[PDB]
Scaffold this motif. Structure first.
Motif, PDB file in Angstrom:
ATOM      1  N   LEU A  82      -6.847   9.413   5.869  1.00  0.00           N
ATOM      2  CA  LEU A  82      -7.293   8.385   4.927  1.00  0.00           C
ATOM      3  C   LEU A  82      -8.787   8.424   4.752  1.00  0.00           C
ATOM      4  CD1 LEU A  82      -4.969   5.425   6.090  1.00  0.00           C
ATOM      5  CD2 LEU A  82      -4.377   7.391   4.582  1.00  0.00           C
TER       6      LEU A  82
ATOM      7  N   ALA B 110      -4.926  -3.218   6.814  1.00  0.00           N
ATOM      8  CA  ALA B 110      -3.648  -2.638   6.441  1.00  0.00           C
ATOM      9  C   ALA B 110      -2.673  -3.069   7.556  1.00  0.00           C
ATOM     10  CB  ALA B 110      -3.748  -1.122   6.367  1.00  0.00           C
TER      11      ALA B 110
ATOM     12  N   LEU C 108      -4.271  -2.698  11.192  1.00  0.00           N
ATOM     13  CA  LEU C 108      -5.004  -1.441  11.115  1.00  0.00           C
ATOM     14  C   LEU C 108      -6.068  -1.390  10.040  1.00  0.00           C
ATOM     15  CD1 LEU C 108      -1.704   0.573  11.596  1.00  0.00           C
ATOM     16  CD2 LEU C 108      -3.619   0.673  13.260  1.00  0.00           C
ATOM     17  N   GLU C 109      -6.954  -0.398  10.142  1.00  0.00           N
ATOM     18  CA  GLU C 109      -8.039  -0.228   9.187  1.00  0.00           C
ATOM     19  C   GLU C 109      -7.538   0.048   7.767  1.00  0.00           C
ATOM     20  OE1 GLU C 109     -12.272   2.248   8.704  1.00  0.00           O
ATOM     21  OE2 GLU C 109     -10.979   2.611  10.454  1.00  0.00           O
ATOM     22  N   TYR C 110      -8.056  -0.726   6.811  1.00  0.00           N
ATOM     23  CA  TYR C 110      -7.810  -0.529   5.396  1.00  0.00           C
ATOM     24  C   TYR C 110      -8.890   0.434   4.939  1.00  0.00           C
ATOM     25  CZ  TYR C 110      -7.734  -1.186   0.327  1.00  0.00           C
ATOM     26  OH  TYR C 110      -7.687  -0.992  -1.033  1.00  0.00           O
ATOM     27  N   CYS C 111      -8.454   1.599   4.503  1.00  0.00           N
ATOM     28  CA  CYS C 111      -9.282   2.721   4.092  1.00  0.00           C
ATOM     29  C   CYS C 111      -9.138   2.784   2.590  1.00  0.00           C
ATOM     30  CB  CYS C 111      -8.775   3.993   4.774  1.00  0.00           C
ATOM     31  SG  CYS C 111      -8.824   3.927   6.585  1.00  0.00           S
ATOM     32  N   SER C 112     -10.036   2.088   1.897  1.00  0.00           N
ATOM     33  CA  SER C 112     -10.023   1.845   0.444  1.00  0.00           C
ATOM     34  C   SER C 112     -10.033   3.115  -0.432  1.00  0.00           C
ATOM     35  CB  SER C 112     -11.153   0.898   0.048  1.00  0.00           C
ATOM     36  OG  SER C 112     -12.425   1.517   0.169  1.00  0.00           O
TER      37      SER C 112
ATOM     38  N   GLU D 263      -1.409  13.184   3.796  1.00  0.00           N
ATOM     39  CA  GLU D 263      -0.860  11.836   3.671  1.00  0.00           C
ATOM     40  C   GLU D 263      -1.348  10.952   4.833  1.00  0.00           C
ATOM     41  OE1 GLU D 263       0.784  14.816   3.522  1.00  0.00           O
ATOM     42  OE2 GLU D 263       2.560  14.666   2.242  1.00  0.00           O
TER      43      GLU D 263
ATOM     44  N   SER E 133      -4.892   8.905  10.685  1.00  0.00           N
ATOM     45  CA  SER E 133      -4.000   7.750  10.676  1.00  0.00           C
ATOM     46  C   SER E 133      -2.575   8.000  11.180  1.00  0.00           C
ATOM     47  CB  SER E 133      -3.947   7.195   9.247  1.00  0.00           C
ATOM     48  OG  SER E 133      -2.814   6.392   9.019  1.00  0.00           O
ATOM     49  N   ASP E 134      -1.916   6.916  11.583  1.00  0.00           N
ATOM     50  CA  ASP E 134      -0.540   6.908  12.084  1.00  0.00           C
ATOM     51  C   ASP E 134      -0.312   7.690  13.377  1.00  0.00           C
ATOM     52  OD1 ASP E 134       2.354   7.030  12.290  1.00  0.00           O
ATOM     53  OD2 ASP E 134       2.373   6.320  10.226  1.00  0.00           O
TER      54      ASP E 134
ATOM     55  N   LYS F 219       0.884  -2.727   9.226  1.00  0.00           N
ATOM     56  CA  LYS F 219       2.037  -1.834   9.370  1.00  0.00           C
ATOM     57  C   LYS F 219       3.185  -2.684   9.916  1.00  0.00           C
ATOM     58  CE  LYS F 219       3.483   2.631  11.139  1.00  0.00           C
ATOM     59  NZ  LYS F 219       3.014   3.877  11.777  1.00  0.00           N
TER      60      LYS F 219
ATOM     61  N   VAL G 161      -8.601   5.894  12.355  1.00  0.00           N
ATOM     62  CA  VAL G 161      -8.282   4.568  11.849  1.00  0.00           C
ATOM     63  C   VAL G 161      -8.405   3.551  12.999  1.00  0.00           C
ATOM     64  CG1 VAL G 161      -6.295   3.135  11.077  1.00  0.00           C
ATOM     65  CG2 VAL G 161      -6.908   5.238   9.811  1.00  0.00           C
TER      66      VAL G 161
ATOM     67  N   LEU H 263       0.768  -1.242   0.000  1.00  0.00           N
ATOM     68  CA  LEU H 263       0.000   0.000   0.000  1.00  0.00           C
ATOM     69  C   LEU H 263       0.806   1.304   0.000  1.00  0.00           C
ATOM     70  CD1 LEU H 263      -2.835  -1.223   2.367  1.00  0.00           C
ATOM     71  CD2 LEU H 263      -2.943  -0.902  -0.114  1.00  0.00           C
TER      72      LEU H 263
ATOM     73  N   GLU I  56      -5.472   8.125   0.480  1.00  0.00           N
ATOM     74  CA  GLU I  56      -5.133   9.374   1.153  1.00  0.00           C
ATOM     75  C   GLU I  56      -5.919  10.546   0.639  1.00  0.00           C
ATOM     76  OE1 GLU I  56      -0.366   8.292   1.742  1.00  0.00           O
ATOM     77  OE2 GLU I  56      -0.988   9.990   0.489  1.00  0.00           O
TER      78      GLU I  56
HETATM   79  C1  LIG Z   1      -5.992   2.383  -1.282  1.00  0.00           C
HETATM   80  O1  LIG Z   1      -5.720   2.279   0.136  1.00  0.00           O
HETATM   81  C2  LIG Z   1      -4.579   2.819   0.576  1.00  0.00           C
HETATM   82  O2  LIG Z   1      -3.767   3.358  -0.132  1.00  0.00           O
HETATM   83  C3  LIG Z   1      -4.431   2.667   2.048  1.00  0.00           C
HETATM   84  C4  LIG Z   1      -5.502   2.246   2.832  1.00  0.00           C
HETATM   85  N1  LIG Z   1      -5.441   2.060   4.151  1.00  0.00           N
HETATM   86  C5  LIG Z   1      -4.279   2.302   4.755  1.00  0.00           C
HETATM   87  N2  LIG Z   1      -4.300   2.114   6.116  1.00  0.00           N
HETATM   88  C6  LIG Z   1      -3.420   2.524   7.087  1.00  0.00           C
HETATM   89  C7  LIG Z   1      -3.814   2.529   8.431  1.00  0.00           C
HETATM   90  N3  LIG Z   1      -2.986   2.919   9.404  1.00  0.00           N
HETATM   91  C8  LIG Z   1      -1.754   3.308   9.024  1.00  0.00           C
HETATM   92  C9  LIG Z   1      -0.837   3.720  10.067  1.00  0.00           C
HETATM   93  N4  LIG Z   1      -0.094   4.043  10.865  1.00  0.00           N
HETATM   94  C10 LIG Z   1      -1.371   3.302   7.692  1.00  0.00           C
HETATM   95  N5  LIG Z   1      -2.201   2.912   6.724  1.00  0.00           N
HETATM   96  C11 LIG Z   1      -3.140   2.721   4.067  1.00  0.00           C
HETATM   97  C12 LIG Z   1      -3.201   2.904   2.689  1.00  0.00           C
HETATM   98  N6  LIG Z   1      -2.086   3.299   1.989  1.00  0.00           N
HETATM   99  C13 LIG Z   1      -0.787   3.510   2.605  1.00  0.00           C
HETATM  100  C14 LIG Z   1      -0.390   4.948   2.857  1.00  0.00           C
HETATM  101  C15 LIG Z   1      -1.181   5.609   3.974  1.00  0.00           C
HETATM  102  N7  LIG Z   1      -0.615   6.921   4.292  1.00  0.00           N
HETATM  103  C16 LIG Z   1       0.819   6.843   4.602  1.00  0.00           C
HETATM  104  C17 LIG Z   1       1.574   6.129   3.509  1.00  0.00           C
HETATM  105  O3  LIG Z   1       0.983   4.848   3.237  1.00  0.00           O
END
Ligand SMILES: COC(=O)c1cnc(Nc2cnc(C#N)cn2)cc1NC[C@H]1CNCCO1
Ligand SMILES: COC(=O)c1cnc(Nc2cnc(C#N)cn2)cc1NC[C@H]1CNCCO1
Length: 258
Positions: free
Chosen positions: A124, A32, A71-75, A121, A134-135, A34, A55, A11, A78
């Motif tokens: 989400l 998701a 962690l939560e997958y936020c489809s 970033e 998030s994070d 980490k 999240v 991701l 960002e």
């Molecule tokens: C199409 O769905 C996505 O892109 C996407 C969904 N759900 C996420 N979930 C979480 C939950 N918690 C954390 C923490 N700490 C991190 N990512 C991450 C996702 N992409 C990764 C990004 C997120 N922004 C920082 C850089 O990487």
């Protein structure tokens, strides 16, 4: 077989490691993961959290040196990818995202937690475009047993950091998160960040303090949201608008539609 998860794709990337999409073999539920090779504090803070604009944390597992956070997958990805460069997004979308961001920040502050790295970033979107903070890697307790503790550690991301973090030895946590939310609002409405950092040496920051709003990105912003930004992006954190006051702002309460 309900405990078996398949790793589908990577991701994103973090400093510590990667964030991977995992899908349950039986239920097809997505999470998701980490991967981190402090981390104890991020876990501890995550166990505290329960809000629709934060999240979800499902759990964690430690294997040798490697640490996994579920962690939560936020489809929807960002909020960063919804901001068109040099343009922003439609004002009703930016207002709805801002409302959700305030709800998440009120919740965190309510429990005595400060995020300290609010940026697009880290915001989400779920399947219904609901914003989730998030994070919590940089997060910390600023209030415990009803006693506030002042912060002193330098952290965050320079375009989004409040000016007091660069000039003062100690500072209150809540105005710092308010300031970064203001920067996020500017980005959503103008598709650009107003300055590299809020310092005396930064020309764009000086221009804003001198109220040169005929310059970008301010000239791209409507007077109502701009009046809110004037209240948020106040150099003195003691004079800066508080969230309870943000909720009373004219633009914050303005009915908007596509
Ligand atoms: C199409 O769905 C996505 O892109 C996407 C969904 N759900 C996420 N979930 C979480 C939950 N918690 C954390 C923490 N700490 C991190 N990512 C991450 C996702 N992409 C990764 C990004 C997120 N922004 C920082 C850089 O990487
Ligand atoms: C509720 C509790 N515990 C979970 N645990 C795990 C364990 N491993 C992965 C992976 N990969 C994902 N979720 C997941 C949960 N809801 C999803």
């Amino acid at each position: 077989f309900v405990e078996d998860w398949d790793l589908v794709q990577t991701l994103g990337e973090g400093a510590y490691g990667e964030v991977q999409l995992a899908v349950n073999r039986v239920t097809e539920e997505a999470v998701a993961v980490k991967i981190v090779d402090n981390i104890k504090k991020e876990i501890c803070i995550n166990k505290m959290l329960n809000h629709e604009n934060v999240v979800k944390f499902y759990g964690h597992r430690r294997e040798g040196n490697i640490q996994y956070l579920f962690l939560e997958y936020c489809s929807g990805g960002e909020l960063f990818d919804r901001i068109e460069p040099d343009i922003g997004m439609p004002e009703p979308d930016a207002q709805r995202f801002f409302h959700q961001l305030m709800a998440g920040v009120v919740y965190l502050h309510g429990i005595g937690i400060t995020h300290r790295d609010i940026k697009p970033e880290n915001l989400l979107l779920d399947e219904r475009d609901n914003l989730k903070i998030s994070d919590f890697g940089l997060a910390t307790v600023f209030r415990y047993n009803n006693r506030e503790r002042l912060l002193n550690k330098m952290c965050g991301t320079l375009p989004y950091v409040a000016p007091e973090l660069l000039k003062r030895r100690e500072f209150h946590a809540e105005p710092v998160d308010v300031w970064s939310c203001g920067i996020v609002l500017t980005a959503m409405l103008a598709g650009e960040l107003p300055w590299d950092q809020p310092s005396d040496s930064c020309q764009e920051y000086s221009d804003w303090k001198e109220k040169k709003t005929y310059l970008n990105p301010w000239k791209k912003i409507d007077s109502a949201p701009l009046a809110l930004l004037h209240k948020i992006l106040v150099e003195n954190p003691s004079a800066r608008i508080t969230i309870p006051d943000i909720k009373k702002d004219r633009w914050y309460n303005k009915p908007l539609k596509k």
